[model samples]
Target: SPLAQQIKNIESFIHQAKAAGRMDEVRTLQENLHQLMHEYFQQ
Candidate 1:
């Protein structure tokens, strides 16, 4: 359930980015999240 919510949150951000014509930002956020989540999770 938490994972689903997290994904939903990310998707929501992407939608907002789309509205702002910031598709690249959404991809960057996704990439940064993918790069960093494991470290945050380990703590």
Candidate 2:
């Protein structure tokens, strides 16, 4: 639950960044989100 919560927050950040036109930040967050998902699946 805790780990999923972190992912959820990242998702929120991505949404805000995208809406704010912060493509750079959105890209960074997107990569990190994917990495986190990878780790999540591994676990």
Candidate 3:
């Protein structure tokens, strides 16, 4: 239950993105991942 855990999940999705053959949800989740992930994680 830490910011690090969520970031780890984002990295996990990277593998899923590959597995699913480029669906936009995965693509956009990853795309927005950077923008939103940084907004809250100050470290």
TM-score, per-candidate, Cα-based: 0.54, 0.91, 0.56
lDDT of 1 by residue, 7-28 (tens): 5577678778878989799888
Cα lDDT of all candidates, in order?
A: 0.70, 0.93, 0.75
Badly placed stretches (over 4 Å) of model 2 are none
Q: List the residue pairs that clash in candidate 2.
A: none
Better of 1 and 3 by lDDT: 3
**Evaluated with lDDT, which candidate comes out highest?**
2
TM-score of 2: 0.91
Encode model 2's per-residue lDDT on 1-43: one tens digit a residue: 5668879999999999999999999999999999999888888
Clashing pairs counted in every model = 0, 0, 0
Q: How close to the true structure is residue 5 of candidate 2, measured as C-alpha lDDT? A: 85
Q: Using alpha carbons, what is the TM-score of model 3? A: 0.56
Question: Whose TM-score is greatest here?
Answer: 2
Residue 32 local lDDT, model 3: 68
Which digits, one per residue and each the tens of the lDDT, describe model 3 over residues 1-43? Answer: 6766777887788778879887876877788678658865765
For TM-score, candidate 2 versus 3, the one ahead is 2
